[PDB]
Short mmCIF file of C-alpha atoms and ligand atoms in Angstrom, two decimals:
data_model
loop_
_atom_site.label_atom_id
_atom_site.label_comp_id
_atom_site.label_asym_id
_atom_site.label_seq_id
_atom_site.Cartn_x
_atom_site.Cartn_y
_atom_site.Cartn_z
CA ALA A 4 142.25 14.30 78.87
CA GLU A 5 143.95 17.94 78.81
CA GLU A 6 144.88 17.60 82.46
CA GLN A 7 146.95 14.63 81.78
CA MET A 8 148.76 16.38 78.80
CA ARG A 9 149.42 19.28 81.09
CA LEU A 10 151.58 16.96 83.09
CA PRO A 11 155.01 15.91 81.59
CA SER A 12 155.49 12.87 79.12
CA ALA A 13 156.48 9.36 80.40
CA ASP A 14 159.78 9.42 78.57
CA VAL A 15 160.82 12.53 80.54
CA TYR A 16 159.29 11.97 84.00
CA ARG A 17 158.31 9.04 85.92
CA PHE A 18 156.15 10.45 88.61
CA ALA A 19 153.15 11.47 86.40
CA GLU A 20 152.05 8.03 85.20
CA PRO A 21 148.20 7.44 85.33
CA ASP A 22 146.88 5.71 88.42
CA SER A 23 145.59 2.26 88.08
CA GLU A 24 145.14 -1.18 89.79
CA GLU A 25 148.61 -2.12 88.18
CA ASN A 26 150.70 0.31 90.24
CA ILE A 27 148.76 1.41 93.46
CA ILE A 28 145.92 0.41 95.82
CA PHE A 29 143.88 2.30 98.21
CA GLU A 30 142.17 1.16 101.49
CA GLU A 31 138.57 0.69 102.10
CA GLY A 38 138.59 13.09 102.24
CA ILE A 39 142.16 11.98 101.90
CA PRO A 40 142.81 8.44 100.43
CA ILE A 41 144.87 5.79 102.61
CA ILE A 42 147.35 3.74 100.62
CA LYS A 43 147.15 0.17 100.98
CA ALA A 44 150.00 -0.66 98.59
CA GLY A 45 151.96 0.47 95.48
CA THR A 46 155.04 0.51 93.61
CA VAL A 47 157.96 2.82 95.22
CA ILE A 48 157.28 5.38 92.39
CA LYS A 49 153.77 5.67 93.24
CA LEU A 50 154.61 5.89 97.13
CA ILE A 51 156.99 8.82 96.25
CA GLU A 52 154.52 10.58 93.95
CA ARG A 53 151.81 10.48 96.81
CA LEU A 54 154.18 11.31 99.47
CA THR A 55 154.80 14.57 97.76
CA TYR A 56 151.18 14.95 96.13
CA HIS A 57 150.23 18.25 94.81
CA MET A 58 146.82 18.22 95.53
CA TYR A 59 147.01 18.20 99.54
CA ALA A 60 149.16 17.89 102.62
CA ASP A 61 149.44 14.34 103.98
CA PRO A 62 151.26 14.53 107.42
CA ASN A 63 149.97 11.08 108.47
CA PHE A 64 151.59 9.53 105.40
CA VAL A 65 154.64 11.56 105.64
CA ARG A 66 155.30 10.66 109.22
CA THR A 67 154.43 6.73 108.60
CA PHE A 68 156.59 6.85 105.42
CA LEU A 69 159.70 8.29 106.95
CA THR A 70 159.31 5.84 110.10
CA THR A 71 159.23 2.70 107.81
CA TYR A 72 160.66 3.24 104.42
CA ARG A 73 164.08 1.50 105.45
CA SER A 74 161.90 -1.80 105.26
CA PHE A 75 161.70 -1.35 101.44
CA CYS A 76 164.01 1.35 100.30
CA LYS A 77 167.57 2.34 101.26
CA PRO A 78 168.16 5.95 102.55
CA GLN A 79 170.41 6.47 99.36
CA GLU A 80 167.47 5.38 97.02
CA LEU A 81 164.86 7.66 98.83
CA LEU A 82 166.97 10.85 98.35
CA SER A 83 167.62 10.32 94.83
CA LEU A 84 163.88 9.37 94.01
CA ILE A 85 162.87 12.77 96.08
CA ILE A 86 165.41 14.72 93.87
CA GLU A 87 164.23 13.20 90.87
CA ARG A 88 160.49 14.01 92.05
CA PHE A 89 161.77 17.64 92.66
CA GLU A 90 163.11 18.02 89.02
CA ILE A 91 159.79 18.41 87.00
CA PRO A 92 160.52 19.34 83.41
CA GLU A 93 158.65 22.40 81.79
CA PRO A 94 156.66 21.84 78.69
CA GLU A 95 158.07 23.19 75.20
CA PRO A 96 156.87 26.72 74.04
CA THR A 97 153.97 27.37 71.39
CA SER A 112 153.17 31.83 78.30
CA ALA A 113 149.74 30.89 79.88
CA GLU A 114 150.15 27.33 80.01
CA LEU A 115 153.64 27.36 81.51
CA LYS A 116 152.35 30.11 84.25
CA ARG A 117 149.56 27.77 85.27
CA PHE A 118 151.75 24.66 85.45
CA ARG A 119 154.48 26.16 87.49
CA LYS A 120 151.88 27.71 89.82
CA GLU A 121 149.52 24.69 90.14
CA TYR A 122 151.92 21.68 89.75
CA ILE A 123 155.78 22.51 90.09
CA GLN A 124 155.48 24.90 92.87
CA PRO A 125 153.23 22.63 95.15
CA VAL A 126 155.44 19.35 94.50
CA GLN A 127 158.61 21.26 95.11
CA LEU A 128 157.46 22.50 98.40
CA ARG A 129 156.19 19.11 99.31
CA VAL A 130 159.65 17.56 98.86
CA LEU A 131 161.21 20.19 101.05
CA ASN A 132 158.51 19.37 103.52
CA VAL A 133 159.58 15.69 103.34
CA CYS A 134 163.37 16.89 103.64
CA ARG A 135 162.37 19.03 106.72
CA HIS A 136 160.64 16.19 108.41
CA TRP A 137 163.34 13.65 107.56
CA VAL A 138 166.17 15.67 109.03
CA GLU A 139 164.26 16.94 112.08
CA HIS A 140 162.92 13.40 113.09
CA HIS A 141 165.28 10.98 111.39
CA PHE A 142 168.57 12.67 111.48
CA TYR A 143 170.26 9.36 112.65
CA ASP A 144 170.12 8.43 109.01
CA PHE A 145 172.64 11.06 108.12
CA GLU A 146 174.67 10.43 111.13
CA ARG A 147 175.02 6.73 109.98
CA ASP A 148 175.83 7.86 106.32
CA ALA A 149 178.03 10.89 105.79
CA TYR A 150 177.69 10.85 101.98
CA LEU A 151 173.95 10.88 102.44
CA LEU A 152 174.30 14.30 104.42
CA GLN A 153 176.56 15.69 101.78
CA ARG A 154 174.03 15.02 98.98
CA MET A 155 171.12 16.57 101.02
CA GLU A 156 173.23 19.92 101.60
CA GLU A 157 174.11 19.61 97.89
CA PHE A 158 170.54 19.37 96.80
CA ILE A 159 169.31 22.08 99.42
CA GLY A 160 172.25 24.36 98.34
CA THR A 161 171.35 24.33 94.75
CA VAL A 162 167.71 25.73 94.46
CA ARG A 163 165.77 29.04 93.61
CA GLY A 164 162.52 30.83 94.02
CA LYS A 165 160.82 33.22 96.45
CA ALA A 166 158.82 30.50 98.21
CA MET A 167 161.64 27.96 98.79
CA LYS A 168 164.01 30.43 100.58
CA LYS A 169 162.06 29.82 103.87
CA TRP A 170 162.05 26.14 103.58
CA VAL A 171 165.70 26.16 102.46
CA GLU A 172 166.62 27.95 105.68
CA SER A 173 164.48 26.26 108.06
CA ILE A 174 166.06 22.76 106.69
CA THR A 175 169.63 24.24 107.19
CA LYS A 176 168.85 25.70 110.56
CA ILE A 177 167.70 22.24 111.75
CA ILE A 178 170.64 20.32 110.00
CA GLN A 179 173.13 22.77 112.01
CA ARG A 180 171.13 22.09 115.12
CA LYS A 181 171.73 18.38 114.85
CA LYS A 182 175.49 19.12 114.23
CA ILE A 183 175.57 20.94 117.58
CA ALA A 184 173.47 18.14 119.37
CA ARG A 185 176.36 15.64 118.49
CA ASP A 186 178.29 17.32 121.45
CA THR A 194 165.35 19.06 137.13
CA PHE A 195 162.50 18.16 139.40
CA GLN A 196 158.93 19.52 139.68
CA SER A 197 158.51 18.33 143.27
CA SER A 198 160.92 17.44 145.93
CA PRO A 199 162.25 13.68 145.42
CA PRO A 200 162.25 11.19 148.33
CA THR A 201 165.45 10.51 150.34
CA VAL A 202 167.56 7.71 148.87
CA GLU A 203 167.19 4.54 150.96
CA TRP A 204 170.26 2.45 152.28
CA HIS A 205 170.52 -0.72 154.35
CA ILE A 206 173.76 -2.84 154.87
CA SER A 207 176.06 -1.45 152.28
CA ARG A 208 177.02 2.21 153.15
CA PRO A 209 177.02 5.02 150.70
CA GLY A 210 180.31 4.64 148.65
CA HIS A 211 180.95 1.00 149.60
CA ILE A 212 180.42 -0.38 146.17
CA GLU A 213 182.36 -3.62 146.81
CA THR A 214 179.59 -4.75 149.19
CA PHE A 215 176.87 -3.82 146.79
CA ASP A 216 174.53 -6.83 146.20
CA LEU A 217 170.86 -7.99 145.95
CA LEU A 218 170.47 -8.42 149.99
CA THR A 219 172.90 -5.65 151.07
CA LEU A 220 171.34 -2.74 149.09
CA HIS A 221 167.94 -1.60 150.11
CA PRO A 222 164.97 -3.19 147.99
CA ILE A 223 163.14 0.14 147.60
CA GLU A 224 166.33 1.76 146.20
CA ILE A 225 167.04 -1.27 143.96
CA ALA A 226 163.50 -0.91 142.55
CA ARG A 227 163.88 3.08 142.22
CA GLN A 228 167.20 2.83 140.47
CA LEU A 229 166.27 0.12 138.02
CA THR A 230 163.09 1.95 137.16
CA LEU A 231 165.14 5.07 136.43
CA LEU A 232 167.48 3.13 134.51
CA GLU A 233 164.68 1.42 132.55
CA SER A 234 162.55 4.40 132.02
CA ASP A 235 165.70 5.98 130.28
CA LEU A 236 166.31 2.85 128.34
CA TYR A 237 162.56 2.84 127.01
CA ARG A 238 162.55 6.49 126.09
CA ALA A 239 165.56 6.11 124.03
CA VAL A 240 163.90 3.74 121.65
CA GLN A 241 163.19 5.16 118.26
CA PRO A 242 160.44 3.54 115.93
CA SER A 243 162.63 2.75 113.06
CA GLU A 244 164.62 0.47 115.31
CA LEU A 245 161.49 -1.77 115.22
CA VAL A 246 160.51 -1.70 111.77
CA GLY A 247 160.99 -4.69 109.25
CA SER A 248 162.58 -6.78 112.16
CA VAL A 249 165.72 -4.97 111.58
CA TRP A 250 167.01 -5.87 115.15
CA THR A 251 167.55 -9.52 114.26
CA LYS A 252 169.44 -8.69 110.98
CA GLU A 253 173.18 -8.36 109.91
CA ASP A 254 173.27 -4.59 110.89
CA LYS A 255 171.15 -4.70 114.17
CA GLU A 256 173.91 -2.89 116.38
CA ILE A 257 173.78 0.32 114.05
CA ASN A 258 170.10 0.01 113.11
CA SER A 259 168.72 -1.00 116.61
CA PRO A 260 171.18 0.31 119.30
CA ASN A 261 168.68 1.53 121.90
CA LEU A 262 166.21 -1.46 121.24
CA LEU A 263 169.08 -4.12 121.65
CA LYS A 264 170.37 -2.05 125.07
CA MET A 265 166.88 -2.52 126.38
CA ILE A 266 166.47 -6.12 125.41
CA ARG A 267 169.98 -6.85 126.98
CA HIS A 268 169.16 -5.30 130.07
CA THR A 269 166.05 -7.20 130.49
CA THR A 270 168.15 -10.56 129.65
CA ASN A 271 170.75 -9.71 132.17
CA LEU A 272 168.52 -8.55 135.01
CA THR A 273 166.20 -11.66 134.54
CA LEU A 274 169.22 -14.02 134.66
CA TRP A 275 170.77 -12.13 137.45
CA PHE A 276 167.70 -12.66 139.72
CA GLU A 277 167.89 -16.34 138.63
CA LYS A 278 171.65 -16.54 139.27
CA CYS A 279 170.99 -15.00 142.89
CA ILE A 280 168.43 -17.69 143.81
CA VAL A 281 170.07 -20.83 142.60
CA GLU A 282 173.57 -19.98 143.75
CA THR A 283 172.35 -19.50 147.22
CA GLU A 284 172.29 -23.39 147.99
CA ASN A 285 171.00 -23.03 151.50
CA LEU A 286 167.23 -23.20 151.60
CA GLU A 287 166.83 -20.72 154.36
CA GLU A 288 169.00 -18.00 152.75
CA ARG A 289 167.37 -18.95 149.21
CA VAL A 290 163.94 -18.05 150.71
CA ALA A 291 165.25 -14.73 151.86
CA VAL A 292 166.58 -14.04 148.40
CA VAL A 293 163.33 -14.93 146.71
CA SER A 294 161.42 -12.90 149.19
CA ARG A 295 163.66 -9.79 148.53
CA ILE A 296 162.84 -10.20 144.87
CA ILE A 297 159.17 -10.17 145.46
CA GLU A 298 159.71 -7.01 147.62
CA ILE A 299 161.64 -5.61 144.87
CA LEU A 300 158.66 -6.43 142.59
CA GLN A 301 156.13 -4.72 145.04
CA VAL A 302 157.83 -1.52 144.67
CA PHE A 303 158.15 -1.76 140.96
CA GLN A 304 153.98 -1.95 141.07
CA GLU A 305 154.07 1.11 143.24
CA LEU A 306 155.92 2.82 140.73
CA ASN A 307 154.16 1.28 137.75
CA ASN A 308 157.22 -0.03 136.20
CA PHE A 309 155.56 -2.95 134.44
CA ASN A 310 158.69 -3.73 132.64
CA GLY A 311 160.25 -4.46 135.99
CA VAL A 312 157.38 -6.45 137.32
CA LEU A 313 157.52 -8.82 134.26
CA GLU A 314 161.01 -9.14 134.63
CA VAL A 315 160.64 -10.61 138.01
CA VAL A 316 157.70 -12.62 136.93
CA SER A 317 159.90 -14.09 133.88
CA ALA A 318 162.53 -15.16 136.55
CA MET A 319 160.17 -16.73 139.09
CA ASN A 320 158.84 -18.68 136.16
CA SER A 321 162.08 -19.93 134.53
CA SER A 322 162.71 -23.52 134.43
CA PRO A 323 165.66 -23.37 137.26
CA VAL A 324 163.20 -20.98 139.73
CA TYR A 325 159.66 -22.23 139.09
CA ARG A 326 160.50 -25.92 140.27
CA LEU A 327 162.02 -24.96 143.64
CA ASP A 328 158.91 -26.17 145.92
CA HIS A 329 160.75 -26.26 148.96
CA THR A 330 161.93 -22.72 148.64
CA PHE A 331 158.25 -21.40 147.71
CA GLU A 332 156.85 -23.33 150.53
CA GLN A 333 158.37 -21.12 153.04
CA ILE A 334 157.39 -17.86 151.19
CA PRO A 335 154.49 -15.97 153.02
CA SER A 336 150.99 -16.16 151.49
CA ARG A 337 150.81 -12.55 150.80
CA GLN A 338 153.99 -12.42 148.97
CA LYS A 339 152.87 -15.50 146.79
CA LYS A 340 149.48 -13.79 146.09
CA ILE A 341 151.24 -10.70 144.95
CA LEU A 342 153.56 -12.78 142.72
CA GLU A 343 150.45 -14.81 141.20
CA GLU A 344 148.44 -11.55 140.80
CA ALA A 345 151.61 -10.00 138.70
CA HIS A 346 151.68 -13.31 136.60
CA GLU A 347 148.02 -13.05 135.96
CA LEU A 348 148.74 -9.68 134.06
CA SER A 349 149.92 -11.74 131.17
CA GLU A 350 147.08 -14.18 130.92
CA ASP A 351 144.55 -14.17 127.94
CA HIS A 352 146.91 -12.14 125.83
CA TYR A 353 147.84 -9.73 128.42
CA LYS A 354 144.28 -8.45 129.18
CA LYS A 355 144.78 -7.45 132.90
CA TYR A 356 148.15 -5.81 131.91
CA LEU A 357 146.54 -3.54 129.27
CA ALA A 358 143.59 -2.74 131.35
CA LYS A 359 146.02 -1.81 134.19
CA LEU A 360 148.22 0.54 131.87
CA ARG A 361 145.47 2.44 130.26
CA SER A 362 143.73 3.27 133.76
CA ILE A 363 147.01 4.77 135.55
CA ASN A 364 148.40 8.29 135.54
CA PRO A 365 152.14 8.98 134.87
CA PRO A 366 154.81 8.24 135.48
CA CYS A 367 155.13 4.70 134.33
CA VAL A 368 157.60 2.08 132.50
CA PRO A 369 155.35 0.09 130.06
CA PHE A 370 156.22 -3.78 129.56
CA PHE A 371 158.41 -3.54 126.50
CA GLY A 372 158.33 -7.37 125.51
CA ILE A 373 154.64 -7.25 124.27
CA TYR A 374 155.53 -4.54 121.75
CA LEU A 375 158.22 -6.83 120.24
CA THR A 376 155.90 -9.91 120.06
CA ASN A 377 153.09 -8.07 118.32
CA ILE A 378 155.48 -6.34 115.84
CA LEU A 379 157.06 -9.84 114.92
CA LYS A 380 153.27 -11.20 114.56
CA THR A 381 152.79 -8.49 112.05
CA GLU A 382 156.04 -8.97 110.14
CA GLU A 383 155.52 -12.67 109.97
CA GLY A 384 151.68 -12.50 109.64
CA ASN A 385 151.70 -10.17 106.54
CA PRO A 386 153.20 -10.37 103.19
CA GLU A 387 156.06 -7.85 102.03
CA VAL A 388 154.27 -7.36 98.53
CA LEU A 389 151.03 -7.81 97.01
CA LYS A 390 150.47 -9.50 93.58
CA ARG A 391 148.49 -7.64 90.94
CA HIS A 392 148.81 -8.71 87.03
CA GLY A 393 152.31 -10.25 87.61
CA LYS A 394 153.65 -6.81 89.07
CA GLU A 395 154.96 -6.44 92.61
CA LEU A 396 153.22 -3.72 94.87
CA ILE A 397 155.01 -2.89 98.04
CA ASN A 398 152.70 -3.71 101.11
CA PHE A 399 152.30 -0.33 102.81
CA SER A 400 149.40 -1.41 105.22
CA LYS A 401 151.87 -3.73 106.88
CA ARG A 402 154.22 -0.85 107.63
CA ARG A 403 151.32 1.25 108.85
CA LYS A 404 150.30 -1.47 111.36
CA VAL A 405 153.88 -1.76 112.64
CA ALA A 406 154.13 1.99 112.75
CA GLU A 407 150.92 2.25 114.82
CA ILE A 408 152.46 -0.13 117.34
CA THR A 409 155.49 2.15 117.55
CA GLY A 410 153.15 4.97 118.06
CA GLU A 411 151.84 3.25 121.24
CA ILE A 412 155.40 3.01 122.42
CA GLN A 413 155.90 6.86 121.91
CA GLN A 414 152.79 7.91 123.85
CA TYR A 415 154.56 6.70 126.97
CA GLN A 416 158.06 8.04 126.56
CA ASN A 417 157.57 11.71 128.12
CA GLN A 418 157.04 10.33 131.62
CA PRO A 419 159.85 11.35 133.95
CA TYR A 420 160.14 10.05 137.65
CA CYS A 421 160.35 12.13 140.60
CA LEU A 422 163.22 10.19 142.05
CA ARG A 423 166.89 11.01 142.61
CA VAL A 424 169.68 9.09 140.66
CA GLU A 425 172.37 7.24 142.72
CA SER A 426 175.25 6.98 140.41
CA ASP A 427 176.79 4.01 142.29
CA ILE A 428 173.70 1.95 142.41
CA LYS A 429 172.89 2.92 138.75
CA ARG A 430 176.41 1.89 137.68
CA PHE A 431 176.13 -1.52 139.34
CA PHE A 432 172.83 -2.70 137.56
CA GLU A 433 174.39 -0.92 134.31
CA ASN A 434 177.49 -3.42 134.59
CA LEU A 435 175.46 -6.48 135.54
CA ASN A 436 176.72 -9.63 133.63
CA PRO A 437 175.43 -12.91 135.20
CA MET A 438 176.40 -14.74 132.15
CA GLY A 439 180.03 -13.83 132.64
CA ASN A 440 181.94 -15.18 129.36
CA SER A 441 179.46 -17.89 129.01
CA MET A 442 176.81 -17.95 126.06
CA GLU A 443 173.33 -17.71 127.12
CA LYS A 444 172.15 -21.33 126.42
CA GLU A 445 175.22 -22.73 128.40
CA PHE A 446 174.49 -20.30 131.30
CA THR A 447 170.70 -21.33 131.37
CA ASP A 448 171.67 -25.10 131.23
CA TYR A 449 174.11 -24.34 134.24
CA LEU A 450 171.34 -22.46 136.28
CA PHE A 451 168.81 -25.45 135.61
CA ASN A 452 171.45 -28.03 136.59
CA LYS A 453 172.11 -25.97 139.78
CA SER A 454 168.41 -26.07 140.52
CA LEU A 455 168.54 -29.79 140.42
CA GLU A 456 171.67 -29.83 142.84
CA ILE A 457 170.00 -27.56 145.40
CA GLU A 458 166.58 -29.26 145.11
CA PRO A 459 166.79 -32.78 143.69
CA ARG A 460 164.01 -34.43 141.88
CA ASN A 461 161.78 -37.18 143.95
CA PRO A 462 162.42 -39.53 145.34
CA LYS A 463 166.16 -38.25 145.88
CA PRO A 464 166.59 -36.74 149.53
CA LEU A 465 166.96 -32.79 150.07
CA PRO A 466 170.44 -32.13 151.10
CA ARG A 467 171.55 -29.39 153.50
CA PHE A 468 174.06 -26.81 152.29
CA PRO A 469 176.26 -24.30 154.40
CA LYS A 470 175.43 -20.63 154.48
CA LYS A 471 177.29 -18.16 152.25
CA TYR A 472 176.14 -14.84 153.74
CA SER A 473 177.71 -13.41 156.91
CA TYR A 474 175.20 -10.61 157.36
CA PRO A 475 171.75 -10.38 158.49
CA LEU A 476 169.06 -11.73 156.11
CA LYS A 477 166.07 -9.70 157.56
CA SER A 478 164.47 -7.26 155.04
CA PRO A 479 164.32 -3.53 155.97
CA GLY A 480 160.95 -3.67 154.23
CA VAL A 481 159.15 -1.62 151.52
CA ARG A 482 157.82 1.47 153.60
CA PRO A 483 160.02 4.31 153.08
CA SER A 484 161.30 6.74 155.66
CA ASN A 485 158.87 9.55 157.02
C1 AWZ B 1 150.33 -21.85 133.33
O1 AWZ B 1 151.33 -22.23 134.02
C2 AWZ B 1 151.65 -21.39 134.94
C3 AWZ B 1 150.66 -20.80 135.75
C4 AWZ B 1 151.06 -19.63 136.85
N1 AWZ B 1 149.93 -19.32 137.53
C5 AWZ B 1 150.22 -18.36 138.50
C6 AWZ B 1 148.89 -17.92 139.22
N2 AWZ B 1 151.43 -17.89 138.62
C7 AWZ B 1 152.39 -18.25 137.77
N3 AWZ B 1 153.52 -17.70 137.88
C8 AWZ B 1 154.08 -16.78 139.05
C9 AWZ B 1 154.97 -15.70 138.54
C10 AWZ B 1 154.59 -17.90 140.05
C11 AWZ B 1 155.87 -18.24 140.13
C12 AWZ B 1 156.18 -19.18 141.12
C13 AWZ B 1 154.99 -19.49 141.98
C14 AWZ B 1 154.94 -20.23 142.94
C15 AWZ B 1 154.43 -19.84 144.28
N4 AWZ B 1 154.36 -21.17 144.98
C16 AWZ B 1 155.05 -22.01 144.26
N5 AWZ B 1 155.36 -21.52 142.95
C17 AWZ B 1 155.92 -22.53 142.18
C18 AWZ B 1 156.48 -23.50 142.99
C19 AWZ B 1 155.48 -23.45 144.36
S1 AWZ B 1 153.68 -18.36 141.42
C20 AWZ B 1 152.16 -19.31 136.81
C21 AWZ B 1 153.23 -19.66 135.93
C22 AWZ B 1 152.92 -20.76 135.07
O2 AWZ B 1 154.10 -21.23 134.30
C23 AWZ B 1 155.33 -21.08 134.60
#
């Protein structure tokens, strides 16, 4: 074959090897890559024949699961440095025009996407950014000039990046605690509507901050979780803290009648979450009512009105049969919404545990890229809900109060959840032990203002 001899030799260039079942596999137009060696992945990422924006996006989202950022940069620079063949210039003019120029453009296309959509890599590693500017500095040619500028214009935008409502939002609601009196802020003293509004604004912001790479390769459960998954972990910790705070509010209210009022208020909070389509919020309340300390409180739930029970039961049924009702509800509503985040983590963990890192062919390891695309498709679903701002006014004091929630204190999670359950046994002992009475802890009126706003 003359076309293969037009390409460089194997002893001078590693990205012009023949394709086979020993180095690359395609899935069942543009071929979609099932698996392959890292060399073949870089080859197809910068393929001369066509543009592959789907593969570029998916590669750059997921590559950290099989290749370090330092390795990737080296490999795309090695790819870029295509050696010219020796002289006998008709062959050299075709080779430059039809192979070198396309591949070199495709490498810079990868660099542009890398810096525009995954600049955080270059924030985490300073030397990585120096190398990229070193490489983008030392270039040539008329066609590259535009790409070399566009890349360096994006880099300086991200250096600078380091350092309004459409309609009229509704009036902020208050109840017992007056505006400013932050010492009196609590579950029953703030207004339930406003608790729900401020948590939704907070959770919306945390949902939108999560980047796809934070979820790939289960990196949030590894040694470098705090650097690789800062927004993700912030979102999980909020959910952990809000859930355990609801549970703490209920079981530390030892008086039965006061505890009924606490539980009823949390169900009211959930009602406003569903008015707002904050599903994350709905399912935090559901998680709290189903926890071991709360779910067993039969005396408490006996006094909760039937309509409130029904609402809480209907919320639970969102999760039944692999979240069927939830998923039908989510696709049917209009913006704005906060999707339930927990399901995405569950399904990514099933993809990660359920598929192998590599595929065996003839004793050689090919990286399983279909595994990465599946994970990226799940992060794609996350992204489609990330541009949905709420027409709701921030209240900084209430925001700050829920931002600084720390129900566990200085306790570990297990010992705190053991405490909560032991507290549940104290306030409502198991049969046949009699139910003791406990004195009231609240000096203020327990009647809720309700969930209809003003006007
Ligand atoms: C399959 O088991 C469950 C079935 C469940 N079915 C339904 C319809 N809703 C569940 N959860 C919601 C969030 C509820 C929590 C508390 C609720 C309640 C209302 N009245 C009483 N309770 C418990 C003591 C007496 S309802 C389920 C939770 C389940 O596991 C925790």
